[PDB]
Amino acid sequence: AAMAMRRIQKELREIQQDPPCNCSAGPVGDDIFHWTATITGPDDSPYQGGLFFLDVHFPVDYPFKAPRVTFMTKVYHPNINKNGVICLDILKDQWSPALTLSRVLLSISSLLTDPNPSDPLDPEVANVLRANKKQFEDTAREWTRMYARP
């Protein structure tokens, strides 16, 4: 428990003292291994202006394994599925203890600006993006409006 708790407490101080811009995060209740976070949709993207809620579960041996991070907000993107599961290399085999939740939230914001349909988690969303990028962006914008209001 111990090294993990001290690391998560340190990250929580850093969210209070020097958070990533346009993000917030903290424990749900009295369990520091369980957080809710938010990111604002990146400017100049179909997600701009949206407020996206994320569920964060830190493992017992954090930071030696990645937190599990999923969306609670519905979002239209080839690398996020209908259950909010995110396909992001650093949340899986490319996890490093030098990464923090703050860095993960920045990486997820970057992922929203770079929808890649070549290796998707949601192949149907990727099919729209590959076939008609404008159509994908329009739908992503509509979903931001419908489902990601603050």
Ligand SMILES: [Co+2]
């Ligand atoms: Co949760």
